[PDB]
Design a protein around this ligand. Structure first.
Ligand SMILES: CCCCCCCCCCCCCCCCCC(=O)OC[C@H](COP(=O)([O-])OCC(O)COP(=O)([O-])OC[C@@H](COC(=O)CCCCCCCCCCCCCCCCC)OC(=O)CCCCCCCCCCCCCCCCC)OC(=O)CCCCCCCCCCCCCCCCC
Ligand SMILES: CCCCCCCCCCCCCCCCCC(=O)OC[C@H](COP(=O)([O-])OCC(O)COP(=O)([O-])OC[C@@H](COC(=O)CCCCCCCCCCCCCCCCC)OC(=O)CCCCCCCCCCCCCCCCC)OC(=O)CCCCCCCCCCCCCCCCC
Ligand SMILES: CCCCCCCCCCCCCCCCCC(=O)OC[C@H](COP(=O)([O-])OCC[N+](C)(C)C)OC(=O)CCCCCCCCCCCCCCCCC
Ligand SMILES: CCCCCCCCCCCCCCCCCC(=O)OC[C@H](COP(=O)([O-])OCC[N+](C)(C)C)OC(=O)CCCCCCCCCCCCCCCCC
Ligand SMILES: CCCCCCCCCCCCCCCCCC(=O)OC[C@H](COP(=O)([O-])OCC[N+](C)(C)C)OC(=O)CCCCCCCCCCCCCCCCC
Ligand SMILES: CCCCCCCCCCCCCCCCCC(=O)OC[C@H](COP(=O)(O)OCCN)OC(=O)CCCCCCCCCCCCCCCCC
Ligand SMILES: CCCCCCCCCCCCCCCCCC(=O)OC[C@H](COP(=O)(O)OCCN)OC(=O)CCCCCCCCCCCCCCCCC
Ligand SMILES: CCCCCCCCCCCCO[C@@H]1O[C@H](CO)[C@@H](O[C@H]2O[C@H](CO)[C@@H](O)[C@H](O)[C@H]2O)[C@H](O)[C@H]1O
Ligand SMILES: CCCCCCCCCCCCO[C@@H]1O[C@H](CO)[C@@H](O[C@H]2O[C@H](CO)[C@@H](O)[C@H](O)[C@H]2O)[C@H](O)[C@H]1O
Ligand SMILES: CCCCCCCCCCCCO[C@@H]1O[C@H](CO)[C@@H](O[C@H]2O[C@H](CO)[C@@H](O)[C@H](O)[C@H]2O)[C@H](O)[C@H]1O
Ligand SMILES: CCCCCCCCCCCCO[C@@H]1O[C@H](CO)[C@@H](O[C@H]2O[C@H](CO)[C@@H](O)[C@H](O)[C@H]2O)[C@H](O)[C@H]1O
Ligand code: SF4
Lengths: 105, 83, 98, 69, 206, 157, 115, 172, 318, 96
């Protein structure tokens, strides 16, 4: 912060709920807790400029976990290729993908 | 303090609602400080297990941790059973 | 989530466009501010739910608390405007050009 | 006389017992002779879904005891 | 720097206070009655209102003006008497008594003793009839509907005293210059006594 | 006649019965005659036990009881509230003043009978009619409504 | 699904009654019948003109007091906390300042309606 | 049911378009009430409960005050609706057409970007703790009383100071 | 089967509403030394059906100054919301089991005021506008304390779930520990239902008919049906919150019978109150709530936060 | 009386929550196997559906890291019926 009063007094008015990995009620981890913990820990102590290049792996993973652009696209591609094959009559979904599974347990 | 007593008596006769409101407000603050059961309310919230108690790896240096849930080690709840 | 957040951002943009493009009533503009508040509340709430961020759920409530204070002051000002001119029209609020 | 008010009251009284009684009976009829399950929390929903999956007939309320293992 | 656009600008006021044209008084004007529960069916009370604050009451009357006073000029004195029943038509016999006394004065005659006691007796029965209507309808306008019903059953019994002396429940035409039209039927005083000894309890309930 | 005519006739009875049984007069009274109207509502006669309930709004009223003298100054207002009653609507003229001007028939300021202003279904004589005489007229209006044949006439058109 | 189903039936029942009420009865539309009611005389102005609000200050106070109760409605979940003393102080302080705010407005005559 | 949340967020968008056109504040107030209800449904749809019901309750109270203020200080002889003015009506219709166009085109160019009409319903709930107990949104809000007390201090101060502020603004 | 259950809630509630119009008119009559309806059916039991058939056979108003969309919508919204308030009511098992059923009630009840506000505004007449602005004032009066009163009670319940109130009261009426809140709650439900002595939005002695003055025929009947349904609802709610009917897991119908008896009694006191008191002035209702109920409600909320902590009596979350 | 009854209701809740604790290991093991089997089934159909697609790697992660990433609901039920997907999105929240 512009004035680091909280750090000087050693208190926490708003430092402890700043990101996903922070403490949650009843220890219910937020989505992408492990990815955000890895990104924050990679970046610690080296500054923002270096962190941008050198923690790029961690940020991309966390970004994928949270926003899920690649996961959505990959499923869109599989479901689109399945639509093409079924119209051509070359693919038949199995019974467990058609609602006739043998449920577990 | 005879001047206030006449004041309080008049307020009781003429503005009883406000007298009750202030008295109830003052009692609500006072009661937790003088009650012997105040300490248990936090202890009861602390004994409610909403989460799975994850076991610890035994390293051979845990004389205080039970090895079974019916070992005589660990936190007892006899205080609550007889509350 | 993807399409819902797009629509919510568009809803904010429309409410802001409403705020920026005055008609006559000041009250109609005060309603557009409440529209932006409402959009931002849902966006914050949906984000917290989608990420399971329970420590952030106080924040949407604080958004509404200060919006209520903003709306109360806006209405209080509107009483003053109406007392001066007998309407809430913004074209009367032009004495400070000179 | 005042007791001539009672025919309307009795009709009111009968009409106000039917909703409670009918809901309780229709629940048992549609939940295998038991109370309709209440899923206040996700854990309870999970148990119902597991009950539905092991039932063999896709109904959570058809229960399986030790005869099934 | 003067410009064509800003040629009409004046300097602001020295104390920042502008003299603006007088703002428009915009009170709501409302017809309260004649067709209104509180208007007695014939009062057109024109109200100036600010919110529900009443700024002016302008009562428009004459919606029951029937020209009684002109009509009386074409009547004999006895023929005019029933017009007085229909003035304060809640206090019928008292209106008769006023007109009877005025005529008796101009005639320089007096009504006999028993007539005067009857006239006071029924004058005070009439006052109760009036105060019941005054109190309970006033309560009914304020929302307390029930006292109207208890006390109008008492009124119905007093209408029977009217009908027993005169044959009419309301417009008796019973008090006339010179006394009253007929003497009391046998048994009327006893029934007035029976009513009178219970009425104060009816007042206590209200 | 036919079974379609029989059914129509029974429906006339049903709708007629409903309007008979729930007559809501306007809270509307002009002079002394209105006092006797209060006495019909009072406990001895209790008009509400027949289903008769005053409502102040003309939009929620079925009957206008012209209970008192109708002056020229009042006539437009009475016509207005009559026009603002939804149909089907009925008028009961109560007392000599409303019936034909009564004691004030020859006045410059008085309408000689409210039936110069509105249509009238029942004329109740008296000055005032007793609460019971008014109640009799209300029960005569109910029997008039019982005779309405609007659906039978529609069927035969 | 069930909550959606019953509320739609509630909407469906209400709208059917409205349609019956508008298409069953015999009508007779004419101007004097449909003019606005005002006790038998014509209105002298529109009902759409400004209507003064004498309790306007209580009204905007109600806006703030309605967000105060919104801050109080999590209390059933908050009493489950281990940090009972913290929760209790926060709730006590919150209620007390709201009382002081009401007390100030009361003594400033802010609850009195304007004349 | 796979279109449920998109339909709701689409209804919400129309409500804000109606508000943005600024008819008489009477209908503006109604527009926010409907949008608030639709917004409550969206929060519910994403697994919310307390937050959705709060915002509707708060906006029900808020628009009742605005109704009262509108009848006193923001009213004209002929209040405008959305249909009253051809120009406002046209931009209402054009705005709805431009919404269909914007969603249609964005679906074509990316197909999975901002708009993914093929995948609607597949990406609403991401993760859910299946066997959990303490998970409802009210628990999160209640942290103001224990773990996020600073959030409640500032919220409480603003309401308290708001009383003193509005009393000062409104005195003559 | 769920559709049959909807019928066996809605239809009996609508018949209960219709006969409450009869019970009100007879109870008021007898307190006034009259009889009330006793001709239209035996002891007047067909009088509600006659009034219903009359109204829906009557010409409905189409006033010229009226803004017609809101004019039609408002009575439609009124009956919808009145019926919707019943679906989460546990008697002892609800049709719809809601986690935050109490908050559902407040939100639904709070939307109900807009039927009054919009009908009065849409009618575009002076007496209807007066009635609408009294509704604005009425809600500001009571809504400020109604939710805090509920809040304090539910700190002994431990949740917003209506079904949990049954278990909370297994051994004792909530009346006993909460009677001061029960008293304030009871006055609030009278104002919330626009009932005497707070029948101000209609108040016929002052505004002729207030918000619904321009309404006729079947549209008028919807407002009346909605008002009488809400009276039963609010008293049934008072019964479940404070007067916990006796519950036994193997005798559910015992709860329903006991619930009905107490709900019938609380509805009778509503009619009894109407027959007894004059009307408040609508500025005086605001002062009653904001200068008497609100101070005590705030003190008692603080007391009911304090109580479970210092008695170690926090109710369970589940 | 409320103090005593609520103290009893707190003891009952602990007993109920302790029954859940005892059973949670079994539910965790079942859920692990169920999730993995569903993911396995998706992988086999991906091997057939994406057979003749250039540059497609069957089973490829979208992440650099090699630690286990739990699947999303969209991933698990992406290839199954609309009802199974709707039940996962709305089952609990629409059960009343
Ligand atoms: C209920 C069904 C409608 C029935 C109305 C009716 O009785 O017939 C009148 C009408 C017949 O013609 P009319 O009686 O001569 O019209 C005169 C009305 O007074 C003139 O009608 P009005 O004065 O009531 O004004 C109509 C106006 C007012 O109507 C409304 O907008 C209220 C309902 C909106 C929901 O509606 C519009 O402007 C068009 C509404 C378009 C939908 C709103 C979309 C933008 C807002 C988004 C938020 C959603 C809220 O139909
Ligand atoms: C695509 C749009 C989708 C819809 C999205 C709508 C967004 C919310 C709408 C909020 C608009 C608003 O409240 O303003 C009120 C503002 C003030 O209204 P007012 O005080 O009641 O009276 C002036 C009106 O002209 C009313 O008085 P008037 O009747 O005397 O106006 C005369 C004139 C007004 O001329 C116009 O039609 C203005 C619109 C020009 C077309 C713009 C196309 C959209 C781009 O009308 C005409 O004769 C031309 C008709 C043919 C136009 C085509 O009205 C306007 O100026 C037009 C409002 C509608 C325009 C919405 C388009 C927003 C896009 C941004 C435009 C600015 C861009 C500038 C940088 C580039
Ligand atoms: C929907 C609700 C309708 C339920 C009420 C229906 C019965 C109403 C009549 C009633 O009860 O009063 C009896 C009335 C009572 O007599 P009354 O009303 O004429 O006399 C009352 C006065 N005292 C007290 C002195 C007797 O019987 C009649 O004489 C009138 C006949 C009315 C018939 C009503 C319709 C008959 C049913 C037709 C159904 C449609 C046919 C389809 C083919
Ligand atoms: C909670 C209550 C909600 C529901 C309320 C329902 C109440 C109605 C109960 C059912 C009765 C419905 C009767 C119609 C209502 C009255 C409307 C009205 O008066 O309009 C009069 C109108 C007036 O017609 P008119 O043509 O004479 O009028 C012409 C113009 N003026 C008015 C100027 C004279 O008549 C009708 O249109 C009647 C139509 C309905 C006909 C009855 C059904 C047909 C049955 C045929 C027999 C079939 C036999 C088959 C077996 C052999
Ligand atoms: C919208 C339809 C709502 C139906 C609700 C139940 C009411 C049924 C009886 C009225 C039927 C009105 C009708 O559609 O008549 C045909 C309409 C005439 O409607 P109408 O103007 O005669 O409606 C009045 C009905 N009576 C005569 C009984 C009062 O004619 C058409 O074909 C126009 C389409
Ligand atoms: C005309 C307008 C009529 C409007 C009627 C207003 C009614 C009051 C407002 C209702 C909004 C609150 C609804 C609610 O909270 O129900 C939530 C319900 C799930 O209930 P929950 O307790 O969370 O249990 C799930 C876990 N077991 O969720 C569900 O079961 C289903 C999803 C809830 C959404 C239903 C919304 C009501 C229906 C609106 C119909 C359209 C009206 C236009
Ligand atoms: C509508 C339908 C009508 C209601 C139907 C139920 C009516 C039941 C009537 C029977 C009730 C019998 C109660 C006993 C009455 C006789 C009696 O013994 O008095 C008891 C007590 C007064 O006792 P007492 O000694 O005479 O007076 C001096 C004492 N200090 O007086 C009491 O305190 C007893 C109080 C009895 C209250 C129950 C009766 C009222 C029921 C209507 C409730 C309100 C309806 C709205
Ligand atoms: C593609 C276009 C198709 C052709 C469209 C033709 C439309 C013509 C509609 C004619 C009107 C019908 O609409 C209806 O008319 C009747 C009588 O006519 C009137 O209805 C009411 O008012 C009048 C007033 O005197 C009474 O005579 C009538 O008995 C009553 O029912 C109303 O005006 C309307 O309810
Ligand atoms: C200007 C605004 C003024 C209004 C605000 C005033 C707030 C002040 C509150 C004073 C009361 C605090 O009351 C305090 O309650 C807590 C629990 O809540 C008690 O705390 C006790 O019980 C708790 C459990 O809850 C134990 O963990 C603790 O060790 C024990 O002290 C304190 O003994 C008592 O002192
Ligand atoms: C104000 C109201 C606005 C209404 C807005 C429009 C509502 C209707 C939404 C249409 C959007 C697409 O709606 C629907 O999306 C689903 C995903 O859930 C698609 O899903 C389905 O078809 C597509 C291929 O065609 C594949 O994903 C797959 O075969 C199947 O899941 C549907 O084919 C599409 O029709
Ligand atoms: C000038 C005006 C400002 C002065 C008035 C305000 C005074 C401050 C009052 C608010 C005090 C907040 O006090 C602060 O509380 C939080 C919890 O909420 C504590 O936070 C502590 O517990 C949390 C629980 O999650 C941990 O995550 C955190 O790491 C730890 O520090 C802080 O250690 C304490 O400093
Ligand atoms: S008829 Fe007789 S009683 Fe009736 S108003 Fe005329 S004078 Fe009075």
């Amino acid at each position: 912060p512009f004035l680091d009063i909280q750090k000087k007094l050693g208190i926490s008015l708003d430092r402890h709920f700043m990101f996903l990995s922070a403490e949650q009620p009843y220890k219910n981890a937020a989505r992408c807790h492990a990815f955000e913990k890895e990104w924050i820990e990679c970046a610690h102590g080296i500054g923002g400029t270096r962190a941008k290049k050198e923690c790029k792996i961690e940020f991309d993973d966390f970004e994928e976990c949270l926003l899920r652009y690649k996961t959505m696209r990959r499923m869109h591609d599989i479901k689109k290729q399945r639509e093409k094959l079924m119209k051509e009559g070359k693919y038949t979904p199995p019974p467990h993908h058609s609602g006739r599974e043998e449920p577990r347990p | 303090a005879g001047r206030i007593s006449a004041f309080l008596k008049n307020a009781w006769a003429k503005e009883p609602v406000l007298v009750v409101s202030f008295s109830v407000w003052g009692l609500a603050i006072i009661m937790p400080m003088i009650s012997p059961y105040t300490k248990y309310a936090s202890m009861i919230n602390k004994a409610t297990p909403y989460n799975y108690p994850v076991p610890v790896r035994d390293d051979g240096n845990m004389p205080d941790v039970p090895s079974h849930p019916q070992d005589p080690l660990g936190p007892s709840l006899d205080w609550l059973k007889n509350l | 989530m993807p399409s819902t957040f797009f629509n919510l951002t568009m809803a904010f943009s429309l409410s802001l466009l409403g705020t920026l493009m005055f008609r006559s009533h000041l009250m109609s503009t005060l309603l557009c501010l409440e529209g932006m508040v409402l959009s931002l509340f849902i966006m914050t709430s949906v984000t917290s739910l989608n990420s399971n961020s329970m420590s952030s759920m106080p924040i949407p409530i604080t958004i509404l608390v200060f919006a209520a204070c903003e709306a109360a002051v806006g209405l209080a000002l509107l009483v003053k405007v109406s007392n001066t001119y007998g309407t809430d029209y913004v074209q009367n609020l032009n004495l400070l050009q000179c | 006389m005042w007791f001539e008010i009672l025919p309307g009251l009795a009709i009111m009284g009968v009409c106000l017992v039917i909703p409670g009684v009918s809901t309780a009976y229709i629940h048992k009829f549609t939940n295998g002779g038991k109370e309709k399950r209440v899923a206040r929390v996700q854990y309870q929903w999970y148990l119902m879904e597991r009950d539905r999956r092991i039932s063999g007939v896709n109904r959570y309320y058809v229960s399986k005891g030790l005869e099934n293992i | 720097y003067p410009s064509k656009e800003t040629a009409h600008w004046k300097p602001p006021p020295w104390n920042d206070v502008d003299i603006l044209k007088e703002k428009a008084v915009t009170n709501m004007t409302l017809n309260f009655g004649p067709q209104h529960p509180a208007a007695h069916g014939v009062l057109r009370l024109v109200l100036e209102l600010s919110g529900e604050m009443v700024r002016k009451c302008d009562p428009h009357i004459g919606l029951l003006h029937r020209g009684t006073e002109k009509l009386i000029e074409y009547k004999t004195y006895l023929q005019a008497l029933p017009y007085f029943d229909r003035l304060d038509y809640v206090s019928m016999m008292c209106n008769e008594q006023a007109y009877s006394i005025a005529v008796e004065k101009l005639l320089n005659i007096q009504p006999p003793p028993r007539a005067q006691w009857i006239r006071v007796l029924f004058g005070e029965i009439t006052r109760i009839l009036n105060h019941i209507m005054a109190v309970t309808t006033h309560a009914l306008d304020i929302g307390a509907m029930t006292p109207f019903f208890w006390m109008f059953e008492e009124r119905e019994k007093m209408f029977e005293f009217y009908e027993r002396v005169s044959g009419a429940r309301m417009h008796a035409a019973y008090i006339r210059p010179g006394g009253v039209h007929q003497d009391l039927p046998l048994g009327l005083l006893d029934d007035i006594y029976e009513f009178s000894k219970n009425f104060s309890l009816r007042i206590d309930e209200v | 006649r036919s079974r379609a005519e029989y059914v129509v006739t029974k429906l006339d009875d049903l709708i007629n019965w409903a309007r008979r049984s729930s007559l809501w007069p306007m809270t509307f009274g002009l002079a002394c005659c209105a006092v006797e109207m209060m006495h019909m509502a009072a406990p001895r006669y209790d008009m509400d036990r027949f289903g008769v309930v005053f409502r102040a709004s003309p939009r929620q009223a079925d009957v206008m009881i012209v209970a008192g003298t109708l002056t020229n100054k009042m006539a437009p207002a009475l016509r207005k509230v009559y026009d603002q009653m939804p149909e089907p609507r009925y008028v009961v003229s109560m007392g000599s003043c409303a019936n034909g001007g009564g004691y004030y028939h020859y006045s410059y300021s008085v309408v000689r009978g409210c039936d110069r202003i509105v249509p009238v279904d029942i004329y109740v004589p008296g000055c005032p009619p007793t609460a019971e005489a008014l109640l009799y007229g209300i029960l005569q209006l109910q029997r008039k409504i019982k005779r309405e044949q609007k659906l039978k006439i529609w069927y035969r058109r | 699904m069930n909550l959606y189903t019953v509320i739609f039936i509630n909407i469906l029942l209400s709208l059917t009654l409205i349609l019956v009420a508008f298409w069953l009865p015999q009508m007779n539309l004419y101007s004097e019948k449909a003019n606005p009611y005002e006790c038998g005389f014509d209105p002298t102005s529109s009902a759409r003109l400004p209507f003064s609000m004498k309790f306007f200050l209580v009204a905007i106070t109600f806006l703030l007091f309605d967000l105060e109760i919104a801050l109080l409605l999590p209390l059933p979940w908050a009493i489950q906390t281990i940090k009972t003393s913290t929760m209790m102080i926060m709730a006590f302080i919150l209620v007390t300042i709201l009382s002081l705010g009401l007390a100030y407005e009361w003594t400033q005559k802010g609850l009195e309606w304007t004349e | 049911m796979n279109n449920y949340i998109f339909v709701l967020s689409s209804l919400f968008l129309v409500g804000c378009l109606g508000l943005a056109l600024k008819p008489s504040p009477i209908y503006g107030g109604l527009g926010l009430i409907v949008s608030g209800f639709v917004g409550c449904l969206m929060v519910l749809g994403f697994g919310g409960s307390f937050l959705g019901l709060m915002v509707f309750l708060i906006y029900l109270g808020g628009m009742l005050v605005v109704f009262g203020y509108t009848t006193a200080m923001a009213t004209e002889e002929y209040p405008e609706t959305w249909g009253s003015n051809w120009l406002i009506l046209g931009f209402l219709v054009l705005g709805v057409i431009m919404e269909v166009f914007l969603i249609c085109v964005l679906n074509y160019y990316d197909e999975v970007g901002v708009i993914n009409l093929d995948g609607l319903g597949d990406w609403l709930m991401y993760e859910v703790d299946d066997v959990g107990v303490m998970l409802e949104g009210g628990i999160g809000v209640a942290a103001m009383y224990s773990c996020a007390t600073w959030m409640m201090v500032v919220a409480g101060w603003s309401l308290f100071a708001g009383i003193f502020i509005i009393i000062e603004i409104t005195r003559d | 089967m769920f559709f049959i259950n909807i019928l066996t809630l809605l239809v009996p509630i609508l018949i209960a509403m219709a006969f409450l119009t009869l019970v009100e008119r007879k109870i008021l009559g007898y307190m006034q030394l009259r009889k009330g309806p006793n001709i239209v059916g035996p002891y007047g039991i067909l009088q509600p059906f006659a009034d219903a058939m009359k109204l829906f056979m009557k010409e409905p108003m189409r006033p010229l100054t009226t803004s017609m969309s809101l004019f039609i919508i408002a009575p439609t919204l009124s009956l919808t919301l009145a019926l919707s308030l019943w679906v989460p009511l546990p008697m002892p098992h609800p049709l719809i089991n809601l986690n935050l059923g109490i908050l559902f009630i407040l939100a639904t009840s709070s939307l109900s005021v807009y039927s009054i506000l919009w009908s009065g505004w849409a009618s575009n007449s002076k007496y209807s506008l007066f009635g609408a602005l009294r509704a604005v004032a009425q809600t500001i009066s009571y809504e400020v304390t109604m939710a805090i009163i509920l809040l304090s009670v539910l700190l002994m319940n431990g949740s917003y779930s209506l079904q949990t109130l049954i278990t909370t009261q297994e051994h004792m009426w909530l009346l006993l520990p909460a009677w001061p809140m029960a008293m304030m709650w009871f006055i609030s439900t009278l104002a919330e239902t626009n009932r005497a002595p707070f029948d101000l939005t209609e108040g016929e002695s002052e505004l002729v008919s207030g918000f619904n003055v321009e309404y006729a025929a079947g549209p008028f009947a919807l407002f009346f049906m909605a008002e009488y349904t809400n009276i039963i609802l609010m008293n049934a709610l008072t019964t479940i919150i404070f007067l916990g009917p006796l519950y036994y897991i193997n005798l559910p119908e015992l709860y329903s019978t006991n619930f009905m008896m107490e709900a019938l009694l609380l509805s009778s006191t509503f009619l009894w109150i109407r027959a007894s008191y004059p009307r408040f002035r609508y500025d005086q209702l605001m002062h009653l709530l904001w200068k008497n109920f609100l101070p005590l409600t705030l003190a008692l909320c603080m007391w009911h936060i304090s109580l479970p902590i210092f008695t170690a009596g926090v109710p369970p979350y589940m | 009386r409320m103090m005593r009854w609520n103290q009893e209701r707190r003891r009952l809740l602990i007993e109920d929550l302790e029954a859940r604790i005892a059973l949670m290991p079994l539910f965790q093991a079942e859920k692990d196997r169920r999730t993995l089997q569903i993911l396995r089934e998706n992988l086999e159909e991906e091997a057939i559906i994406m057979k003749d697609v250039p540059n497609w790697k069957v089973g490829e992660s979208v992440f650099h890291t090699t630690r286990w990433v739990p699947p999303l609901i969209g991933e698990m039920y992406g290839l199954r019926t609309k009802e199974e997907m709707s039940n996962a999105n709305f089952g609990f929240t629409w059960y009343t």
